[PDB]
Amino acid sequence: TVINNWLLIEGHTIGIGDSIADSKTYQDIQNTIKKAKQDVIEVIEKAH
Amino acid sequence: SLKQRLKGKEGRVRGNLMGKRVDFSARTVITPDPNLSIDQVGVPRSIA
Amino acid sequence: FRLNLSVTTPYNADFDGDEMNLHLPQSLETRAEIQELAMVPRMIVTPQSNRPVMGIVQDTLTAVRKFTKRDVFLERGEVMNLLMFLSTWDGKVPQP
Amino acid sequence: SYTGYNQEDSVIMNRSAVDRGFFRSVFYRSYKEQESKKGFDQEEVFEKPTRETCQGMRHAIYDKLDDDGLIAPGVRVSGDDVIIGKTVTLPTKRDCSTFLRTSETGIVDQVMVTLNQEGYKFCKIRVRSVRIPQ
Amino acid sequence: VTCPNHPDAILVEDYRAGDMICPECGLVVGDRVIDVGTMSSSDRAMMNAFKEITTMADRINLPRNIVDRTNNLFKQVYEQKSLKGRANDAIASACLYIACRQEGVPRTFKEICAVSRISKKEIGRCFKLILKALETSVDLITTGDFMSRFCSNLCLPKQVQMAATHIARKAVELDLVPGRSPISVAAAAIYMASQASAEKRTQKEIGDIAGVADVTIRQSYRLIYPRAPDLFPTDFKFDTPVDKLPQL
Amino acid sequence: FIGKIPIMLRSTYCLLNGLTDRDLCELNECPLDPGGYFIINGSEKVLIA
Amino acid sequence: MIYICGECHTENEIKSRDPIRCRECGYRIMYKKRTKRLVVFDAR
Amino acid sequence: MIIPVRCFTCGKIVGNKWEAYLGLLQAEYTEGDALDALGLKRYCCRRMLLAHVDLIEKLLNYAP
Amino acid sequence: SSVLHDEFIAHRLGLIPLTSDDIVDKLQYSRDCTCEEFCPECSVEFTLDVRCNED
Amino acid sequence: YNGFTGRKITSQIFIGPTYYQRLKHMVDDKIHSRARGPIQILNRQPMEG
Amino acid sequence: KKGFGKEHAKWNPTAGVAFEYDPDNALRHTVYPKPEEWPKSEYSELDEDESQAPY
Ligand SMILES: [Mg+2]
Ligand SMILES: [Zn+2]
Ligand SMILES: [Zn+2]
Ligand SMILES: [Zn+2]
């Protein structure tokens, strides 16, 4: 009871500002993903 | 025949002595109500 | 039918179109034995794994995590307001 | 999260928007009855069963029925009302009938009378009922 | 069902709870007791006759409510067995003629002959025996009952069909045809009607449909012709003046 | 004569084949109804592939 | 009582225990006429 | 089937504006302009006209 | 005999706004007034009657 | 703003128009109760009425 | 008849009723995470290059 009745003073939600990241982060994520893909290609060629 | 009448699932022993239909029971949809205790439930007035 | 959330986790319920059966004790010995054996306060901890089955759930837990930081300060008005909802309250206001 | 009444897959909804037509709907339902001659003497017929002649009836009211044995459209038929009066002749007259289910509170929409495939007279009745979100 | 304490003036049956309590004071005289609502020798020939009844009814092709009573009429005729020593197929055919009349839609013996081997005379003979056998009355024929299918067989529009019916109706009310078979009369009226519309047909074709001849219609026509103009309904649209109605 | 075959609605052998919306509405039929089902004793039946 | 044809909408009193057909149209689907006892609604 | 007489959220009267919307659009006013000229502004009252399907004009094709 | 059923029209009527400028203070609540079901002291009677004849 | 006290809400709420549907399962159709109702005849077990 | 808006929503006399106070977070009743992305209120008295009044 007391935490619901405080919770209408504080309030809560989920938008899509809660679901996005800054460019510095996105660029770093893209860099590592590209490197991982290249490594798989190197493994494939040696097997042949 | 009297074997098929006293036989298995929905017979006279698996269907009328162990499992039987009981009077005095009502079912209704559930909805929240945070103003109740744990010890309580809220019954509508037509079922009651 | 209307029930408290803390009771959702034993029954494994959710409120998107479930249905729940209710049985009514008729004699007086059976109402006494349900009262002294199987009430919902008497079944908080389980013998299966010697821990409780019911704990704070859903919004209440998130709000409690945000009600108990160190930068959270309550003015006099909502101290009056929130202390209106305690059934186990002394009658005394704690000094801030 | 507003007051706790929308926890664990629920929704709070505006009451004074429901009063302006929000998500209001209607609900129709039809019933069939067919008079039949199952035997040479056992014969059925649509008629208004009278208390002293017919015998197997319940004490429910039979005033809404017309002379034919069917309810004219427009009346407000509630639960446990009789809508079709069908009497069987006894080898005097032993009446049957059709009653509503419980808790309908409908309004009789329209009544149709015609002949089905094997040529027995039969009728269809449609009941209208409005459903406001709750 | 009897209570020692007091007399029972009324015992309502509660359909909803499947219960029986007595209103005047109250007592379940009965609680939870009311539930809430080659081998064939006989008629080997009768059994086959109803297949043959069905096989006879099938040719006419119509909702067979007439047939079930035809089956019960025979069953009844069979049971008395006063007329047992007679041909079954004639009785079946006679049962059939009767049912159509019993349904208020008789079919001509001529038609009934089409679906059976029995002479019209033997059907008529058997018919009277059944009337006597089952002791039941009949009804008189009306022309309009055959206005529908014949005009249909000619694909004549309702207006002609309905006009004919009035012409027929007016003619019989005036008895312009004393003793004349209403079949030949209806047909001449139909002829007159068809002759009053673009849908004209030769008497022989009509005669062929009514199962009669063209000379048979010619006489009946001669009897109705004097009143050809006035016999028509007030709601009609000529395709040919009554003056220009042919003579034969 | 041999017998009678059911007819799938809106086929080339139905009474509604190649009609215009002014006539489909005149027989109390919906111009948007797709067709492709049978009418058997009042009911509407559909065949599953 | 009084019935309404399903095609031409011409009212015609059909007597008890009588065949079900229109007149001037020859049709076999009849609709019963609306009642004359009055029922009141709420705009609510 | 027919334009509601009141917006479900505000309560502003929206029923009388249906014919006008068709006319302004007919005049080739772009939809954005038409709504503004009618005077609806809040995006709860614009949803009323922007997303309305008029089924009453197709039930008037069946003879009574 | 229109396309909408009876309870559809009874609902689109209640939401029509009536001029309530000055005579709301002279009207009793129909549950307080000492009259019968209705009287010109706690009510106002309307009437509609339309018939379509042209095509 | 809060509707009961008119105060502002500390968080900002995500609001916008969406498209909802009304399913067929209504509650007027799923409520039922029994208390000493009609019983059968042969086995005297509770029966529907 | 006569009534008010607690009976039914056909008896209330008003469309939307706007209301607001403290157009700039001088009291910090609401807390912006990034106070720069928020449009300035219609009633504000701040400069064009400010976000909130000082607490
Ligand atoms: Mg679930
Ligand atoms: Zn007609
Ligand atoms: Zn609005
Ligand atoms: Zn009054």
Curated annotation (Swiss-Prot), chain E:
Look up the EC number in the record and give it: 2.3.1.48
Changing R222E: what effect? Inhibits interaction with RNA polymerase II
Q: Region labeled Core promoter DNA-binding — which residues?
A: 121-125, 181-184, 215-218
Impact when changing K132E: Reduces interaction with SSU72. Inhibits interaction with VP16. Inhibits RNA pol II transcription activation induced by VP16 but does not affect basal transcription
Tell me how this protein assembles: Found in a ternary complex with TATA box-bound TBP. Part of a TFIID-containing RNA polymerase II pre-initiation complex (PIC) that is composed of TBP and at least GTF2A1, GTF2A2, GTF2E1, GTF2E2, GTF2F1, GTF2H2, GTF2H3, GTF2H4, GTF2H5, GTF2B, TCEA1, ERCC2, ERCC3, TAF1, TAF2, TAF3, TAF4, TAF5, TAF6, TAF7, TAF8, TAF9, TAF10, TAF11, TAF12 and TAF13. Associates with TFIID-TFIIA (DA complex) to form TFIID-TFIIA-TFIIB (DAB complex), which is then recognized by RNA polymerase II (Pol II). Found in a RNA polymerase II initiation complex. (Microbial infection) Interacts with HIV-1 Vpr.
Return the annotated region ranges for Necessary for TATA box-bound TBP complex formation: 176-248
Q: Which organism is it from?
A: Homo sapiens (Human)
Q: Which UniProt keywords apply?
A: Acetylation, Acyltransferase, Chromosome, DNA-binding, Host-virus interaction, Metal-binding, Nucleus, Phosphoprotein, Repeat, Transcription, Transcription regulation, Transferase, Zinc, Zinc-finger
Q: How changing K128L affects the protein?
A: Reduces interaction with VP16
Q: Which InterPro entries match?
A: Cyclin-like_dom, Cyclin-like_sf, TFIIB, TFIIB_CS, TFIIB_cyclin, Znf_TFIIB
**PTM annotation, UniProt:** Acetylated. Autoacetylated; autoacetylation at Lys-170 stimulates transcription activation.
- UniProt tissue specificity: Expressed in the inner cell mass forming the embryoblast. Not detected in cells from the outer thin layer trophoblast (at protein level).
Gene3D superfamilies, per database record: 2.20.25.10, Cyclin-like
User: Which is a GO BP term held by this UniProt record?
Assistant: positive regulation of core promoter binding
UniProt sequence repeat ranges: 56-132, 150-226
The top EC class, named as a word, is transferase
The effect of K170A is: Abolishes autoacetylation, represses transcription activity, does not inhibit its association with chromatin to promoter-specific regions and decreases the association of GTF2F1 with chromatin to promoter-specific regions
Question: Does the record bear Metal-binding in its keywords?
Answer: yes
Name under which the protein is recorded: Transcription initiation factor IIB
Q: Which GO terms describe its molecular function?
A: acetyltransferase activity; DNA-binding transcription factor binding; histone acetyltransferase activity; nuclear thyroid hormone receptor binding; promoter-specific chromatin binding; RNA polymerase II complex binding; RNA polymerase II core promoter sequence-specific DNA binding; RNA polymerase II general transcription initiation factor activity
Residue numbers binding Zn(2+):
C3, H6, C22, C25
Coiled-coil regions listed in the entry: none
